[PDB]
Specification:
It catalyses: Mg(2+)(out) + ATP + H2O = Mg(2+)(in) + ADP + phosphate + H(+). Strand 21, helix 21 and strand 22 form a beta-alpha-beta unit. Helices cover about 45% and strands about 15% of the residues. It has an 8-stranded mixed β-sheet, with helices on both faces. Strands 10, 11, 12, 13, 14, 15, 16 and 17 form an 8-stranded mixed β-sheet that branches. Strands 3, 4, 5, 6 and 7 form a 5-stranded antiparallel β-sheet that branches. The structure holds magnesium ion (MG). Magnesium ion binds next to helix 23, helix 25 and helix 26.
Length: about 850
């Protein structure tokens, strides 16, 4: 920070507002097109939404830094060094395919996740001159067009586009955690109320760029733009913009890290045992290359990405359009679901039930009062208005339409949460009818009609009305109170201020029948381990009653007022053991989701509201609907076609299947590779030659992975997808430790069979031995898949899908017939005598039966 720029801000904050208009050449009405153009030409332009794009060459490097590709490149270069061009070329092709696949996937991710902030859809509210004749108005212009000395208006949830001086403010609060480091918002006043000057960042009359407005409204004037902002650049995200990678790529990286760990503790050991026993350190390093390449699945990223892609494709037919590949991983493992009640628990169809007055008696004059407000409205079509319109009879409707004529209408606004319609049956007096939320109705009503008699509205009547609508809400009934007022005829236009001293004729009640499909869906969601939570903005009574029909156990309720007082940890503790949250603002939903995220649960939020998008952004997975507002869809992570918990439940089941397959392949390949590597290690000392060469091991792995291409099409047992899928190397390591030595035992048997029975006990005839262990190693690896895929019995209690069973047969045929081919010469393999095949079959059958029997010892 420059000291010179640290004094101009203080001077402007302490400068009188009277002289501020002339200093920046700004008028109270605003800035015209010519004035704005001159200011832009002279001072410059503000921070443009455009940012530095990632070059094609630069993106390839970050697309390559992942540890798996580094390990593969190291192995390929080493194989090139040790006079092995074929293996090095194959490894190079594998790493190139991996890089291209990661490239296309990362381009898709960048399309899905361009940056932390779009900075393009963000605009600013400026006065300007819309009519160009001094009429002015309100415009939504990009922040880049904000010139210095421009009058702007601030509202809650709007980030500061540039440095501004507060001219007028009404309870304006700004979160300056980025600049000042304080999370607590600092109130901003029109005049500097701070006693001590010389603190430009702490000045209450100055707001800097990069900060947001927590609450309140204000009208400030821009003082700096472009590089003149105290933030400086605030847009130099040229490189390392996506510091956090996909959780999917993170999973692949940690899986590769486990195997790298195993290599770094096993390859040196082999180098020692064979290399000290014999003394040929070149062959010792060749053994080290063999063990290092033994456990390194070549197409691990290819198979995992294929599995996730197939999951995403088959979810598309289940009305679950998943945006990103990574989203499936979080979708399977999700265990807490936070949804609003309207549209998921209850169908959005809203029928009308009852015509009660303040006394609760069924009164039809309340329907007469309500019908005019709905019919004589010219605003946006309302489904509730059509409901109350249908509620009334046709003859009475025609009589009312003939008797009354529309005069004026008050549009519905969130500030008052009410809408009023002015109608008149004659030219002497006019009748104003207003409907809305109950509390806002009593706030504007001073008298009520009790049993058809006008009575002053005292406190006892307020309490009795509160009790009766409390009973209505406990029934599950959305109460809407209707108010009427008689005023003399006038030529003026009625405004929101005219809704005062009205007479509350009665209350109308509406109910939402819960979806017929939602009860089994909620019963099944708990059968999948998913805990359903309701974060609803409606009344606590209505939500509690709604939870009863569906079958969800409301238990004790939590009101959004209480959660405001609590801190992060206590609120997280409360939210862990509570199911329903009511009377919630969007920030409350975001905070509750973030606090639920802490303990490790993968929390997903489902919403289709305009203000619901930040909750979608915060959660581990944001589920929205195609029929929602566009911004929510762009901020989501799964856009299912229609709001239904049955569709989401089936989507979760399929997203668990995709995870079970993707993890099952990892465990199978890791265990088999570790078994082969262990066998190489234990027999490294005794064999004067390599058990199997790297070119032999690499081809075996490639063919096994080709047989692993059908894994995404496998049939997952219902036991696997019955709980959230967790991914941790702690269990992968012990699975490898258990299921490696079982393979190593039979590989030792194969070593002994070659050494003694077939007399391949001389380094001049190592090819028969090396070739011989290759056929059995490649056959057993693919054959053990059917034994170890399922905890239950291998063929009579749980079978495998056709693609998997087939590809296994094809790879077996390729492996057996590979030595009997011209390709044997280039692969350093040779033909095998017919006496081998019965021994091969015996070894494979023994390995299968043994492994199936031992299998029960995991638990
Ligand atoms: Mg093996």
């Amino acid at each position: 920070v420059p000291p010179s720029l640290s004094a101009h801000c203080l001077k402007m904050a302490v400068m009188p507002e009277e002289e501020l208009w002339k200093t920046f050449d700004t008028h109270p009405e605003g800035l015209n097109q010519a004035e704005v153009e001159s200011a832009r030409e002279q001072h410059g332009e503000n921070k443009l939404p455009a940012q530095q794009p990632s070059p094609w060459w630069v993106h390839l490097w970050v697309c390559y830094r992942n540890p798996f590709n580094i390990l593969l490149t190291i192995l390929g270069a080493i194989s090139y060094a040790t006079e092995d061009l074929f293996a090095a070329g194959v490894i190079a092709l594998m790493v190139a395919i991996s890089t291209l696949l990661n490239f296309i996937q990362e381009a898709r991710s960048t399309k899905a996740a361009d940056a932390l902030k779009a900075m393009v859809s963000n605009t600013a509210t400026v006065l300007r001159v819309i009519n160009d004749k001094g009429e002015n108005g309100w415009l939504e212009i990009p922040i880049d067009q904000l010139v210095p000395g421009d009058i702007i208006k601030l509202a809650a949830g709007d980030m500061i586009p540039a440095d501004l001086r507060i001219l007028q403010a009404r309870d304006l609060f700004v979160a300056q955690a980025s600049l000042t480091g304080e999370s607590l918002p600092v109130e901003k006043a029109a005049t500097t109320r701070q006693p001590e000057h010389s603190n430009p960042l702490e000045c209450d009359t100055l707001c800097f760029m990069g900060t947001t407005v927590v609450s309140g409204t204000a009208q400030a004037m821009v003082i700096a733009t472009g590089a003149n902002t105290w933030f400086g650049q605030l847009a130099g995200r040229v490189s390392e913009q996506e510091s956090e990678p996909n959780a999917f790529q993170q999973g692949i990286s940690r899986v590769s890290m486990l195997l790298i760990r195993f290599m770094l503790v096993m390859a040196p050991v082999v180098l020692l045992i064979n290399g000290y026993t014999k003394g040929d350190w070149w062959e010792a390093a060749l053994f080290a290359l063999s063990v290092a390449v033994g456990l390194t699945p070549e197409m691990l990223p290819m198979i995992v990405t294929s599995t996730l892609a197939r999951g995403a494709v088959k979810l598309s037919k289940q009305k679950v359009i998943v945006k990103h590949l990574d989203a499936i991983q979080n979708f399977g493992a999700m265990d807490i679901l936070c949804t609003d009640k309207t549209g998921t628990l209850t169908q959005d169809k809203i029928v009308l039930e009852n015509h009660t007055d303040i006394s609760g008696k069924t009164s039809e004059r309340v329907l007469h009062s309500a019908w005019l407000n709905s019919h004589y409205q010219t605003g946006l079509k309302n489904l509730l208005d059509t409901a109350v319109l249908e509620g009334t009879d046709e003859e009475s409707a025609r009589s009312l339409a003939s008797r009354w004529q529309k005069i004026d209408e008050i549009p519905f606004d969130f500030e008052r949460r009410r809408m009023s319609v002015v109608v008149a049956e004659n030219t002497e007096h006019h009748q104003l009818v207003c409907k809305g939320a109950l509390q806002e109705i009593l706030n504007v009503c001073s008298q009520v009609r009790h049993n058809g008699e006008i009575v002053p509205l005292d406190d006892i009547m307020l309490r009795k009305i509160k009790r009766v609508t409390d009973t209505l809400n406990r029934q599950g009934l959305r109460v809407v109170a209707v108010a009427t007022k008689y005023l003399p005829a006038r030529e003026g236009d009625y405004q929101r201020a005219d809704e005062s001293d009205l007479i509350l004729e009665g209350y109308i009640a509406f109910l939402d029948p819960p979806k017929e499909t939602t009860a089994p869906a909620l019963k099944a969601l708990k059968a999948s381990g998913i805990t359903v939570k309701i974060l609803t903005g409606d009344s606590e009574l209505v939500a509690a009653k709604v939870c009863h029909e569906v079958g969800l156990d409301a238990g004790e309720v939590v009101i959004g007022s209480d959660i405001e007082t609590l801190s992060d940890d206590e609120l997280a503790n409360l939210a862990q053991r509570t199911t329903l949250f009511a009377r919630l603002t969007p920030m409350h939903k975001e905070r509750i989701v973030t606090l639920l995220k802490r303990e490790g649960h993968v929390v997903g939020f489902m919403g289709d509201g305009i203000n619901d998008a930040p909750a979608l952004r915060a959660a581990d997975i944001g589920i929205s609907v195609d029929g929602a507002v566009d911004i929510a869809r762009e901020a989501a992570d799964i856009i299912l076609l229609e709001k239904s918990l049955m569709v989401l439940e089936e989507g979760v089941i399929e997203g668990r299947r995709t995870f079970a397959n993707m993890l099952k392949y990892i465990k199978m390949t890791a265990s088999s590779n570790f078994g082969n590597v262990f066998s190489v290690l234990v027999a490294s000392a005794f064999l004067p030659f390599l058990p199997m060469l790297p070119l032999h091991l690499l081809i075996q792995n490639l063919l096994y992975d080709v047989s692993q291409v059908a894994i995404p099409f496998d049939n997952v047992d219902d036991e696997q997808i019955q709980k959230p899928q967790r991914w941790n190397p702690a269990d992968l390591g012990r699975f490898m430790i258990f299921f490696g030595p079982i393979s190593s035992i039979f590989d030792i048997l194969t070593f002994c069979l070659m050494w003694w029975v077939f007399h391949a006990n001389t380094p001049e005839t190592q090819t028969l031995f090396q070739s011989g262990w290759f056929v059995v190693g490649l056959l057993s690896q693919t054959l053990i898949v059917h034994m170890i895929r399922t905890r239950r019995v291998p063929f009579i209690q749980s079978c495998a899908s056709w693609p998997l069973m087939i590809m296994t047969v094809i790879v077996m045929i390729v492996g057996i017939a590979l030595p009997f081919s011209p390709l044997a010469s280039y692969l350093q393999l040779q033909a095998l005598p017919l006496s081998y095949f019965p021994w091969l079959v015996a070894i494979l059958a023994g390995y299968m039966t043994l492994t199936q029997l031992v299998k029960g010892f995991y638990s």
